[PDB]
Amino acid sequence: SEQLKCCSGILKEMFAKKHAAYAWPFYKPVDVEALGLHDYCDIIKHPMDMSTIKSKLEAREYRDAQEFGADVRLMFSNCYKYNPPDHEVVAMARKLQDVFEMRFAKMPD
Amino acid sequence: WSWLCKKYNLIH
Ligand SMILES: [N]
Structure with a gap:
């Protein structure tokens, strides 16, 4: 739960100006x-974007932080x-993913 | 001016 709040903060900075x-x-x-x-x-069978991830965080669809990170990396793999x-x-x-991977790895444990 | 316009010009 506390790591899910960090996932919301990571996505918030990913949205930041x-x-x-x-x-x-x-x-x-x-x-x-x-x-x-x-x-x-035909090429992308499972699309994903930051707005969908945000709605799934608000709906508490992600069980843990690892499932959240999988959707974030799915968004990049599709691109x-x-x-x-x-x-x-x-x-x-690659730029945005580097920002994500750093903050996702630096998440308080 | 929209996200879709920028998105369109970026991909194509
Ligand atoms: N383009």
């Missing part, structure tokens, strides 16, 4: 219809899987 320049592509779900990504649902390696959104994903 300090990281917005590279974290914004992951704020909301990938709208496959509006963005014209007509192959996304690494769908986009080319040299794509600009891949570099932005």
